[PDB]
Design a protein around this ligand. Structure first.
Ligand SMILES: Nc1nc2c(ncn2[C@@H]2O[C@H](COP(=O)(O)OP(=O)(O)OP(=O)(O)O)[C@@H](O)[C@H]2O)c(=O)[nH]1
Ligand SMILES: Nc1nc2c(ncn2[C@@H]2O[C@H](COP(=O)(O)OP(=O)(O)OP(=O)(O)O)[C@@H](O)[C@H]2O)c(=O)[nH]1
Ligand SMILES: Nc1nc2c(ncn2[C@@H]2O[C@H](COP(=O)(O)OP(=O)(O)O)[C@@H](O)[C@H]2O)c(=O)[nH]1
Ligand SMILES: Nc1nc2c(ncn2[C@@H]2O[C@H](COP(=O)(O)OP(=O)(O)O)[C@@H](O)[C@H]2O)c(=O)[nH]1
Ligand SMILES: [Mg+2]
Ligand SMILES: [Mg+2]
Lengths: 426, 428, 426, 428
């Protein structure tokens, strides 16, 4: 009945995206050829939310893959599950963006964007009732950031009444993977505040921490990091794909969690997460899950939620569970940690429960926090950007692509405004 | 899909190219005849059946050095028309290279380049290998650079340059040439990667236990760095960086386009066995001045941008940790206008090693491209050298003979003074 | 219904602690894997007092292991029963304290203490109703003494209404195992008088004597010594874990035995103790047990109870016994030895009986004496400390870690005060 | 997990290190090639696969002694970069060691130490082996000690020192060197364990029935003591004592940091069979002056702190009993300000014995570290010796030649006078 259209932009976007797709396939019992080999009828009932049926009992992701370089695409196509994707849904350029937002948004991306838009339009027009769009990408690169952002805006123009979701991997506090990261991030944020309905702030640093401290992983891989993100994504759409006792889809969650339009930057979290050794030495009950959820060590954003206050929290539970227990525990946590919840929104917690747990587990949870602590992240980027601009450093790389200084200033202004707004509510 | 053209200019360039191409062949399993019994396609075109040809042009104004290529082991590897030779050399004279001798062969070389480009679907750009000191490496290269910009423009151009040492130097006129080529090439080059023969010698002696390093050894060492730089294009990695990237991440102002290369670990089979070559340890090695490939004092300068290209059995988290540690270390200082100073590439393929080479086989390596205000010092000495000789007009007549005017020298001086000023000012 | 949280600090603490845990496991029929293989339903009814149920019919000690060195931890994990412990409950530093109280309390311990506190907090919050805490440690080292003491204080701040119990191995009279022992002991005592509810004074010398004279053990091991301590501990909590005719838990015992807050340093004792040969030549009756209990040779503190007076005695009996006999015998002993009991507390003896005897035996007893003779121990330490301070010997090792002379003086003052108080009542 | 770095300075240091490392290898089953077919990790790093490398640095200002290491049986055991040699020795001259010759190599050795430390997760500290009398053992060691304190500071530093004998001595300037190194190292060392060659000779002759003990034998004997000291870190025991412990338990005032070593039982296979080597008997042996490793009169001094490290088949109770007995004995006197004088370690592993060694295999051993006012006597004789020679300014010119000033000698004298005064005053 309801449909979700998936977009992947740039290297990061593609790589997370592939993992996500794999996860989804596993969940719905679909193999790398597109054929359903599942058992439970529940797995197929709402398969149309993510998959088009392409005849011969074969299913294909409603997924669009975009990059200014073909290498990523090649890597994807050759990977496990590369064959399930529709060949015509890979839309690639030849040049690349060289970690330049300007190229992604105004130059190379501009040339290619039309084709992708057309593909998206086609996808929408086949599907009976699109709920909306989910875009996976980084804010630190050129493609995912500049071209992805462009795509968002164009999508919104066509479909202003549909929900626009992003899973954005943002620049970490400790270590930077690009020199121009603050610029790319900032510009992306500028467009995101105005054109998305919600943005899930994923931080690689946080993921690494989780892998090391919670998962006890000596040598985490980028794949492993991506897996967590994928899991979170899966958790977020579970009520669209399976039955439940209390169901909340993308719109319900959004309305519960966004009290003012601009404040839609979430810190996602996933629970439970245990080692191979520490699997034995804890019981699988709701309390444990709750504990895991409400903990700085389990947040996928590099921000301490105890340095701000939660405006809203959405908790999405999967498995056969006592609702009473959930209700009690959510209450109890709030009572305990009253100081970390804004006082003028009574009952800060929204709860949803889906009967189908993920594979291999008896019970799972996904957490979405809208915390005023996110401001810290914004502040750090903002300061950096200001510093860089003070010396006009690297600016000719962007102005050379047709961009004007004024745009930068505007972006800065928006960034500062957002943080001010966050502070006000805090 | 996306392709890279290599240009080898003068003796030094040609010899480096020989090494590099050999290494490439070894890495992709291409025999010296062009046969192999598909990413290598970025460097090699394919002809008919079971033959692969480098996307390369070799140029020298005298025949002797290239004649060795055309008679040597890899004679069948290169197509004859891409090995271009004149009759008379530039005789360590920029003017002969840029004007008198160079203007006779430049058109031909441009045509070949154009033909090469015709076979490209996604041209990334050009890698030019040349010395600063030789008449062809300087004069011809500047001519070629300018021409490239007109024909192409927006495509990225990268230089690998044997920068002259402070104490050790072969030519007498080398300073003149270096200044002049710098002046003429400045507005035409996007990024130039300097290295120094003295530094490579010292590293060979100290780290590889080689009593008497030969030019071949140096060339081989250079080849590794080149491989590291281009591995992101020639293989698929975890997190990877193309040729279009560097210029944006390493050049904060257009004229300050001289990042320097450092490779680690460079060690023999003796000292390789008795060491756990971890990611942190290799990374740390790169930020200590004795291992770096240009003779210069980074401790007396500040870092502006640093790019680290890792290869082999390497995982992101440990790299991140290493970077954090480096940041923490007070003796490694970054300029205040650059809070994010690292650009990081990680590729799955370990460095392949040439049979009969000086280097041991390692699980991991790193090539750092670093941009530092310490280059100012290097520039200064060169300037001083120029100044002395010009004060007496020593050798000036030769240049004039080949059509150069005295005013050009003055202009060159002025431009270098400007450059050094710029370098100073960025620091503060 | 009621819960006990166990803490082990330093080498001594860990080593005793492990033994204790083993003993408890044996008693409750739990094997080194955490699974119950017992027979009697009584063994499992109150298993929650010491064990959390971690699902898959597996049980895990509510035990926190703390040390500034990892070697001890490693030794424990590799030992028999090392696998039953929750891996996340081992909290270890890297440096060590080098038998320096200052390091344990102010420096190295300070760095690590937060983590341990957090773990303890977590443990408390899972358990429904904590009775309180038991800490095993020495007073003579740096970790158990300095860090252990620190832990106590922090615990008390959080949980001021819960019972704080210590099993402290104290410096012997004859031979010293460290040169700075008097300092470490003294400082520990200073904190203990103010922050614990009761402290069981264990002396290694006394244990050795017991092993040699009573147990007829040619070559006693530290393990054997620890065993006795473990047994005593088990005896002390028996009424929480099993049924009985007359039951006394930790609070009941404390109120019976501590007439003034500062006078909470007990001389524990355990009965019966026989050789392999002398097992045949005595009958297992209450009188024998009583005799064993009221005897200087059977006390685990290096103090002669006949050199002072008993303020209070608590006797805890295990096995199927006639209460009348017990009552008579306790009366009779008091009548006989009137001069060793304070005259202004009529009926100096408190009695408790648990129906479940320990394994391998028909009947057992645990003795807790609050004797004014403990003053002797305090005096001996005090004198030594004063002597050392007279020459400022070793002081720079402590002052170098940020400690001030004034603290030492304060500690001395408290020590002297305690002994004066003891004398007054005597 | 927790690691220990060994530094071997000069001839004596190097030779002792050779013994010690051999012993370690024997104990952990490490072959001379670094292979073994996990507590040993505290002393050995692990590289790649099936190779283990000592956490050690060997330093000498001349090549000859270390050249034997690099050509000998254990050439593959050590990594080449951790065996550091200059060209010219310190020629029994503190000044050459500390200034003229030492300042050329110190930076290099510091760098290596830093690199070693980089591979440590829980660095316990450093063990430095050196003579007081040699120019490198004195002058270089003092230089190195000072440097260590600046770089590290809070980490513990322990010295093993061949203290010069009263009658037997090799060098002529030995007193000068001993005083000067004492002066300069005093504020930088936490604890220094002296031993004496005369004493070891006598013990070898008397207790082991060896007519003609060689330096090798002495070294071997020393190695055992070292093993005893570090067994608490290299194995797991009943009741055990780390390197951080000693400094707190043996040093009552900062300058009085010279405890002395005694080992028991040291006996051949002849006299081992015809004896029940019980715990009491071995312990008692250690408090009789003929078995102690420094020539000196404890009967004329008082004990201030005593640390007993037992190894092998030993049970606490008997040790306790032995200690009690010792306390009871009127001829073994402890200062009145120290009622608790014993620190006790007990480790399960019996002493391992080198094939072809002088010592028989025993069930139990003990290493006592004792701090005694009797060291004052030893200091006094040395002082007297210094005084005589300086009265005539004998040899003083040599020191001056290498940059030392006469005033330094005076300062050194003054400091030693202070030290002896302090020692006296503690006694009363
Ligand atoms: N690294 C390296 N440097 C070289 C090699 N050959 C020459 N050089 C350096 O190149 C500079 C001399 O320039 P050449 O390349 O020989 O001269 P050329 O480019 O042929 O110019 P002309 O002969 O004057 O036309 C000096 O700085 C040499 O040290 C080589 O094989 N490897
Ligand atoms: N125990 C022991 N002592 C030694 C050994 N070799 C030398 N000594 C002692 O060390 C002192 C002489 O110092 P060396 O170590 O030979 O001199 P060095 O440190 O090399 O100093 P220079 O040669 O002067 O630079 C004398 O007291 C010797 O008795 C040895 O193998 N074992
Ligand atoms: N989580 C995650 N982040 C990635 C991955 N690959 C790259 N990144 C991040 O993406 C940023 C670089 O952007 P990238 O997507 O490679 O550039 P683009 O291809 O031009 O969009 C850096 O912040 C990287 O940390 C990945 O596989 N997973
Ligand atoms: N009863 C008992 N006492 C011990 C044991 N190990 C050490 N001790 C005592 O503890 C004191 C030394 O403290 P230790 O625990 O080693 O120092 P820490 O590791 O810093 O706490 C001495 O008085 C020893 O007699 C043991 O296993 N059992
Ligand atoms: Mg030439
Ligand atoms: Mg020597």
């Amino acid at each position: 009945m309801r449909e979700i259209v998936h977009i992947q932009a740039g290297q990061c976007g593609n790589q997370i995206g592939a993992k996500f797709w794999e996860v989804i396939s596993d969940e719905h019992g679909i193999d790398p050829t597109g054929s359903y080999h599942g058992d439970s009828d529940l797995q197929l009932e709402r398969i149309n939310v993510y998959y088009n049926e392409a005849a011969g009992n074969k299913y294909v992701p409603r997924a669009i893959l975009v990059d200014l370089e073909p290498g990523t695409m090649d890597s994807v196509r050759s990977g496990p599950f590369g064959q399930i994707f529709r060949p015509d849904n890979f839309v690639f350029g030849q040049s690349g963006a060289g970690n330049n937002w300007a190229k992604g948004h105004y130059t190379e991306g501009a040339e290619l964007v039309d084709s992708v838009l057309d593909v998206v339009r086609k996808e929408s027009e086949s599907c009976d009732c699109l709920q909306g769009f989910q875009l996976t990408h980084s804010l630190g690169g050129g493609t995912g950031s500049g071209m992805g952002t462009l795509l968002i805006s164009k999508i919104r123009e066509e479909y202003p009444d549909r929900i626009m979701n992003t899973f954005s991997v943002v620049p970490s506090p400790k270590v930077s993977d690009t020199v121009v990261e603050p610029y790319n991030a900032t510009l992306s944020v500028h467009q995101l505040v105005e054109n998305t309905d919600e943005t899930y702030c994923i931080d690689n640093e946080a993921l690494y921490d989780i892998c090391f401290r919670t998962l006890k992983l000596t040598t985490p891989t980028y794949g492993d990091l991506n897996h967590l993100v994928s899991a979170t994504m899966s958790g977020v759409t579970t009520c669209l794909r399976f039955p439940g006792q209390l169901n909340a889809d993308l719109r319900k969650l959004a309305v519960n969690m966004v009290p003012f339009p601009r404040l839609h930057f979430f810190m996602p979290g996933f629970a439970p997460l245990t080692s191979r050794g520490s699997q034995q030495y804890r019981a699988l009950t709701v309390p444990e899950l709750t504990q895991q959820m409400f903990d700085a060590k389990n947040m996928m954003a590099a921000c301490d939620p105890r340095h701000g206050r939660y405006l809203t929290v959405a908790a999405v539970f999967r498995g056969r569970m006592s609702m009473k227990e959930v209700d009690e525990q959510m209450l109890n946590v709030q009572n305990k940690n009253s100081s970390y919840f804004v006082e003028w929104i009574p009952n800060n917690v929204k709860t949803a429960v889906c009967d189908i747990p993920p594979r291999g587990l008896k019970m799972s949870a996904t957490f979405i926090g809208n915390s005023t602590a996110i401001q810290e992240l914004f502040k750090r980027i903002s300061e950096q950007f200001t510093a860089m601009f003070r010396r006009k450093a690297f600016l000719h790389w962007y102005t050379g692509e047709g961009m004007d200084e004024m745009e930068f200033t505007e972006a800065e202004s928006n960034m500062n405004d957002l943080v001010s707004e966050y502070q006000q509510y805090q | 899909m996306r392709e890279c053209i290599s240009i080898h200019v003068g003796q030094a360039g040609v010899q480096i190219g020989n090494a590099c191409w050999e290494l490439y062949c070894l890495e992709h399993g291409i025999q010296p005849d062009g046969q192999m019994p598909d990413s290598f396609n970025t460097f090699f075109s394919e002809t008919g059946a079971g033959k692969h040809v480098p996307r390369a042009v070799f140029v020298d104004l005298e025949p002797t050095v290239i004649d060795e290529v055309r008679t040597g082991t890899y004679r069948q590897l290169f197509h004859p028309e891409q090995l271009i030779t004149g009759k008379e050399d530039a005789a360590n004279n920029y003017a002969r290279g840029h004007y008198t001798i160079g203007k006779e062969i430049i058109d031909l070389v441009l045509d070949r380049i154009r033909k090469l480009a015709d076979q490209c679907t996604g041209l990334q750009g050009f890698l030019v290998f040349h010395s600063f000191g030789g008449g062809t490496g300087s004069g011809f290269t500047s001519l070629l650079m300018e021409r490239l910009s007109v024909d192409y423009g927006k495509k990225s151009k990268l230089e690998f340059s044997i920068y002259p040492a402070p104490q050790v130097s072969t030519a007498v006129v080398e300073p003149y040439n270096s200044i002049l080529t710098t002046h003429t090439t400045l507005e035409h080059s996007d990024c130039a990667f300097m290295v120094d023969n003295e530094a490579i010698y010292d590293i060979c002696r100290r780290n590889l236990d080689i009593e008497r390093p030969t030019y071949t050894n140096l060339n081989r060492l250079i080849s590794q760095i080149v491989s590291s730089i281009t591995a992101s294009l020639r293989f698929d990695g975890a997190l990877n960086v193309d040729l279009t990237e560097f210029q944006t991440n390493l050049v904060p102002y257009p004229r300050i386009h001289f990042p320097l290369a450092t490779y680690a670990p460079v060690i023999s089979a003796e000292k390789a066995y008795h060491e756990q070559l971890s990611v942190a340890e290799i990374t740390n090695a790169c930020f200590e001045p004795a291992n770096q490939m240009v003779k210069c004092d980074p401790r007396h300068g500040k870092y502006m941008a640093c790019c680290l290209l890792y290869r082999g059995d390497v995982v992101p988290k440990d790299v991140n940790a290493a970077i954090a540690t480096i940041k923490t270390k007070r003796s490694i200082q970054f300029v205040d206008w650059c809070p994010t100073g690292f650009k990081v590439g990680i590729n799955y393929q370990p460095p392949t090693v040439v049979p009969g080479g000086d280097l041991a086989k390692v699980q991991r390596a790193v090539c750092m491209l670093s941009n530092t205000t310490a280059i100012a010092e290097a520039w200064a000495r060169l300037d001083h050298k120029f100044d002395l000789m010009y004060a007496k007009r020593a050798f000036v007549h030769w240049y004039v003979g080949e059509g150069m005017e005295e005013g050009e020298f003055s202009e060159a001086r002025e431009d270098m003074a400007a450059l050094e000023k710029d370098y100073e000012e960025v620091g503060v």
